Write an enzyme that holds these catalytic residues in place. Structure first.
Site, short mmCIF file in Angstrom:
data_model
loop_
_atom_site.label_atom_id
_atom_site.label_comp_id
_atom_site.label_asym_id
_atom_site.label_seq_id
_atom_site.Cartn_x
_atom_site.Cartn_y
_atom_site.Cartn_z
N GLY A 198 -12.20 3.94 1.73
CA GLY A 198 -13.51 3.24 1.63
C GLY A 198 -14.29 3.24 2.95
N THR A 199 -13.60 3.49 4.08
CA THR A 199 -14.24 3.62 5.41
C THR A 199 -15.23 4.80 5.42
OG1 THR A 199 -12.44 2.49 6.58
CG2 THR A 199 -13.80 4.02 7.87
N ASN B 65 -10.28 0.22 -0.88
CA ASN B 65 -9.36 0.05 0.25
C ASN B 65 -10.15 0.36 1.51
OD1 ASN B 65 -7.57 -0.16 -2.01
ND2 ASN B 65 -6.07 1.14 -1.04
N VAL B 66 -10.28 -0.60 2.42
CA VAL B 66 -10.99 -0.37 3.70
C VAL B 66 -9.99 -0.72 4.79
CG1 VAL B 66 -12.78 -1.31 5.27
CG2 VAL B 66 -13.35 -0.78 2.86
N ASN B 67 -9.53 0.25 5.56
CA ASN B 67 -8.50 0.03 6.59
C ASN B 67 -9.07 0.29 8.00
OD1 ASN B 67 -6.17 -0.52 7.95
ND2 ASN B 67 -5.32 1.51 7.53
N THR B 68 -9.33 1.56 8.37
CA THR B 68 -9.63 2.02 9.76
C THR B 68 -10.95 1.39 10.25
OG1 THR B 68 -10.65 3.97 8.89
CG2 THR B 68 -8.34 4.19 9.54
N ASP C 184 0.86 -1.20 0.00
CA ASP C 184 0.00 0.00 0.00
C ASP C 184 0.89 1.25 0.00
OD1 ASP C 184 -2.44 1.29 -0.11
OD2 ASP C 184 -2.76 1.27 2.06
N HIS D 47 -8.81 9.55 4.11
CA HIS D 47 -8.38 8.58 5.16
C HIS D 47 -9.05 8.94 6.50
CE1 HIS D 47 -4.56 7.64 2.64
NE2 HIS D 47 -5.41 6.61 2.54
#
Lengths: 284, 284
Positions: A210-211, A230-233, A85, A180
């Site tokens: 994406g969050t 992209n889904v992180n948090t 990433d 983000h």
């Protein structure tokens, strides 16, 4: 049953109107959660690795060995890619590839367009020698501390046309209002630019931050050629909530596994939800 | 640096009046903290693994892979053994050895002496085919549940002499009042019997239940031939307090690494103190 690049899975997604999720391995525990989500949803999946996560876990090669050991141990049959990433340099991409990554994002978006195209084209030359997929970026992803996204951070579609033609990248991340962390209000996504960039580039597109994007936006982004989100948090938050909750309910708890197991179950449910929203479920 | 069996490290301990600690890997990032503790203290170390821990982490082979990968990335030079704790059967010993374990404990102490002897002898035959070390037990370790340790639970020295001589085990664990988890009060260790067991057996002795064994008790166990001491719940208790604290002092923390990082630090400092107390610091 081994690892694969993002090439085939994002093309299958672009062709059939669905997105593959990228879920970042925060720490070693997360890795198992991401694989059993994907296995249970019969979903392809992208395991994202940051340089910072890699430093925390002991390097690119340890993370590859542990994902490969975990796929063996849980009989994972779905397509799994390991992707660097926002890779900052040629050197980090080479190091990630040498460790066994199947995909890299070379993030030249802070550079002038010509420097970005040159750097990207050199990573592609390397990556495509050994079946590795490459993502590139134009424009700038919202920071959590930036409030609303400056119009000047949006990708310009004619730059996107040039960058993708000149580099040979497999997939492309135009920054069109993504942030983000928590969206301050409504997400202001440039769908008209997204459609243009789709049409001009002819490659699968990538949606960062994406969050908090609602099913309406996700479904719209996918219709306009988004095949990777992209889904992180969201996962980090579901993990930490589950830990806080079991610690707060049981003061005697002292075995870390008794707070890690609820953390894992929460991460897994978050990710399965997104695989279902993105339409990757049942595609493996 | 390859993994090694417990044979050389426990002999060096017995011969020079120190013990090697066994720290059990509770979950994947406990492993990091155990190897960093050993390397910084220039100490040998034994990574204990339960069947329950292997089930949580995805199996024996994944744990061995991860320990070797971590050793490689943190440049571990100290002697490291991976040991199956309280191995319940010949089958689990074989599965641990097949995965790359360098040491097993075959725990037959709930069987009649003659069955424990036969079981142990069969595991030694296998283990000693491929340079694996073997631990056996007589008598039984208590739990925080039953408080006072029954006298029927203490190992009988003439039985220790027979089992070690008939089986060829490398080291031996006599239950002499040890308990898992916290002591009702002061521990009632049978040191006269321990000394007898040391003289009649001539192998390094193991002390189970080392959590919350006072310093004088530990130093006395070493003087009477304990060269291996198992510490588990101390480390679990130190990881979980670090996690409670950091979440308690910051309501908005959401990135699991921010609570994992001080857990790792609390574990490492716990294990370093044990390595100074047992005398393995500096011995690597």
């Amino acid at each position: 049953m081994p690892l694969v690049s993002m090439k085939d899975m994002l093309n299958h997604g672009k062709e059939n109107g669905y997105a593959v999720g990228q879920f970042n391995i925060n720490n070693l525990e997360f890795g198992q959660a991401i694989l059993q989500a994907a296995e249970e949803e019969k979903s392809p999946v992208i395991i994202g690795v940051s340089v910072g996560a890699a430093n925390y876990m002991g390097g690119f090669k340890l993370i590859v060995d542990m994902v490969k050991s975990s796929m063996d141990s849980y009989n994972v049959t779905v397509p799994v890619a390991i992707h660097l990433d926002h890779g900052p340099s040629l050197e980090k991409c080479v190091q990630a590839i040498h460790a066994g990554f199947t995909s890299v994002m070379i993030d030249g978006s802070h550079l002038p367009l010509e420097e970005n195209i040159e750097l990207t084209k050199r990573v592609v030359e390397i990556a495509h020698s050994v079946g590795v997929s490459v993502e590139a970026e134009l424009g700038r992803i919202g920071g959590q501390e930036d409030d609303v996204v400056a119009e000047s951070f949006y990708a310009i579609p004619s730059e996107c046309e040039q960058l993708v033609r000149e580099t040979g990248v497999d997939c492309f991340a135009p920054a069109l209002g993504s942030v983000h962390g928590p969206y301050k209000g409504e997400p202001k996504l440039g769908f008209d630019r997204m459609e243009e960039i789709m049409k001009l580039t002819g490659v699968p597109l990538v949606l960062h931050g994406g969050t908090g994007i609602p099913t309406k936006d996700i479904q719209k982004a996918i219709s306009l050629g988004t095949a990777k989100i992209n889904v992180n948090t969201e996962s980090q938050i579901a993990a930490t909530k589950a830990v806080r909750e079991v610690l707060n309910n049981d003061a005697k708890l002292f075995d870390p596994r008794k707070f890690l197991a609820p953390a894992r179950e929460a991460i897994k449910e978050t990710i399965k939800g997104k695989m279902r929203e993105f339409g990757s479920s049942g595609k493996a």
